[PDB]
Design a binder for this molecule. Structure first.
Ligand SMILES: Cc1ncc(COP(=O)(O)O)c(CNc2co[nH]c2=O)c1O
Ligand SMILES: Cc1ncc(COP(=O)(O)O)c(CNc2co[nH]c2=O)c1O
Lengths: 414, 414
């Protein structure tokens, strides 16, 4: 207990407003995170003082912009404990990162008979690129089954991954179930069968320490907007030996060395994978978000979210007619459904109380079908959320159930 | 003469600072543009007040974020006079836009015998994707020759484009020569031969009115960072009938309709081409930049730059031992070389005087080889630049030539 939630919330201006006459209760951070003043003011200082194109060699502002951009790259490398800045590629988000792996690695290393292994809980960003890659290569897509509590057993991984598996793609933390998957053990299993492992870390990176050397993941993808950083920015980490043999996914300026009429050569890593003017301000702001989270401490944030999750699970179990999906040990989110109430109505009623949650399939339709549901509601937490906000959520859920129950009993007597 | 350059410069905080003890003279807007307070404060208001993920249906902040994002899309449609918002795709920049055309259109519509026709003046962003597409399809890449003044004659276009040409890719305005290419006539020629036309408008969009219906371009690409907007944002316009038949370049959430285990269906345009959480803040800020430029008036900006260019050409012709490349009628930039002085040294010396220019190949190596030079220096203008800054530039060039000349004559007597 070191982080002061009041002092933390003070730095997020967007939290201090009312919606529909109620204080805002933002419980949708798995959709996107809010930003502290440090990040916004970093963007401000960039645009006010030293914006210029990068990879300079000349004027002063351009040198400052380049120093900021590449310094943000080093901040990311340190943040996820990569060995080298050559392994840190700035992208526009997790989805693009995974698509780059699918185009530049998968489509070049898949033949008929090869297998791509994923799971039923994957976000669409970690499903559709593999569907398209196996369709383009004639390979086979396989799914690791889930336990009844929404977890993955290592025996099922060993059964699904075979000597024909070349890629295992798996989420670090599920944006729906809250499950934290055994990424390190799955990486060992994939390597034992001759496969690489691609980790979707969009939901893990904001909330827990990432050590790619301890995870031994071959690729790791993350999104800035979920971790207090600017929108439109993400990272692809890849083992350097793998990135060296992969061809670029995009072509143009900045990523070339020599350009002839018909043939060209590429720059060294990481710039080989960064075509065109890069996301300068967004990457610098992501570096600022990393500084912010590191000063608070990712372990502290994870402990705070563990307490929030345990509190929320207990208080949800106090509600009648509410079903929660996923395991007991979980990240900081709760996906649920009210008996006989569609989750979109739940979320509308909650917004009328100032509470922001998300209703729908959460970009995980195969998981919804596995859960035997059409849609769900989800309240997700971050470092600025409190137990009082969870109390407001559970009270609003009780009031929602009562309201729908007795308008039903009112006009069934009509 | 309606725009007041003092009142315009007042809105750009970054211009009001010193570099190396001299007032900043920023003449590098072809590399990237500076931002007015309207754009920066738009980003601020987004992150301070209504950041949330988009394509909602539920809570209030999410609705406001979606309204901002799609309203920016409509602003772009109006700005370039597209028929429909379905034709406006948000990307991370011109380079990505052109790569999307090359992957989703070119690689699907090119067979052996087909031709992709480009020009010798193209930026690398409008060269390498076509190189890779013709290599992947076995098609042929052809180059339209240039006149001695760096312009393109329509007869050379008719000679190069044949009945086997399926794509003509050409820059609207050259970032090196300042040439404004006859895009409308070239589009007529390409359509007469059964080809589509792809327009690289990265350098035209910030400085002159764009009317895609009058140009009749099939694709048009632009970058936000060159037109007073945030970094990491761009637009791909494509004729709707063409975009409907093109498969997505990226896959994941937000761009799907139904997702099965092995097959999926895509959303309608434009969202079919926008995978993952989009560039929300950057797109809203690009809309703000469009509002800013429209309130000033693109025709006014073009007239101001025409005067700046004529003034600069005249004053450059007053300098001995300076060569300027390109035609007399031009956009607002001057690419040049000092006799017996490497342009990187020119640009270093100028930065010591507070003047920001760019030295190098400007991501146009085939053009440099066509010019029979290794590198060039370039001063590029925008709406905040003045004739006094051009005076400072030409005086600093005279002083550079004198300094190098007589340190040469000093230590040749050594
Ligand atoms: C696990 C996981 N993978 C991939 C993505 C998508 O990456 P991005 O969009 O490219 O930043 C998300 C975002 N998840 C959600 C986005 O909105 N609701 C969500 O649950 C995610 O949670
Ligand atoms: C004509 C032209 N096409 C494409 C691009 C690149 O697009 P983007 O990088 O994806 O925004 C540029 C940027 N031109 C320059 C960028 O730095 N110096 C330049 O001359 C350009 O001027």
């Amino acid at each position: 207990g070191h982080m002061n939630i009041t002092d933390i919330r003070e730095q997020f201006p967007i939290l201090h407003q009312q919606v529909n006459g109620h204080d805002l209760v933002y419980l949708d951070s798995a959709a996107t995170s809010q930003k502290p003043r440090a990040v916004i003011e970093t963007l401000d200082k960039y645009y006010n003082q030293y914006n210029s194109n990068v990879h300079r060699g000349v004027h002063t502002l351009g040198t400052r912009a380049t120093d900021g951009y590449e310094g943000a790259r080093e901040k990311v490398r340190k943040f996820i404990n990569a060995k080298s800045m050559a392994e840190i590629i700035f992208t526009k988000g997790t989805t693009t990162s995974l698509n780059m792996v699918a185009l530049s690695y998968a489509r070049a290393n898949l033949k008929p008979g090869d297998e791509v292994v994923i799971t039923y809980m994957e976000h669409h960003a970690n499903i559709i690129p593999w569907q398209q890659a196996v369709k383009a290569t004639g390979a086979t897509l396989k799914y690791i089954p889930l336990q009844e509590d929404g977890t993955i057993s290592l025996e099922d991984v060993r059964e699904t991954v075979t000597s024909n598996t070349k890629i295992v793609a798996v989420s670090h933390v599920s944006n729906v179930l809250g499950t934290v998957n055994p990424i390190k053990e799955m990486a060992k299993i994939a390597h034992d069968n001759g496969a690489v492992i691609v980790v979707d870390g969009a939901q893990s990176t904001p909330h827990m320490k990432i050590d790619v050397q301890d995870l031994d993941c071959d690729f790791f993808a993350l999104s800035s907007h979920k971790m207090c950083g600017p929108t439109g920015v993400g990272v692809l980490y890849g083992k350097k030996a793998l990135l060296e043999n992969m061809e670029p996914a995009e072509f143009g300026g900045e990523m070339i060395d020599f350009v002839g009429l018909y043939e060209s050569t590429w720059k060294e890593l990481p710039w080989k994978f960064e075509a065109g003017t890069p996301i300068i301000a967004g990457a610098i702001g992501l570096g600022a978000a990393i500084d912010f989270l590191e000063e608070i401490g990712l372990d502290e944030i994870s402990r705070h979210e563990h307490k929030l999750a345990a509190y929320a699970l207990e208080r949800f179990r106090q509600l009648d007619g509410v079903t929660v999906y996923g395991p007991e040990e979980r990240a900081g989110l709760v996906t649920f459904n009210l008996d006989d109430v569609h989750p979109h109505d739940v979320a509308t009623v909650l917004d009328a109380e100032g509470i922001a949650v998300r209703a729908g399939h959460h970009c995980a339709q195969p998981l919804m079908k596995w859960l035997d549901v059409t849609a769900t509601a989800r309240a997700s937490f971050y470092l600025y959320n409190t137990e009082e906000e969870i109390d407001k959520l559970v009270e609003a859920l009780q009031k929602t159930k009562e309201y729908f129950t007795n308008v039903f009993v009112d006009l069934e007597h009509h």
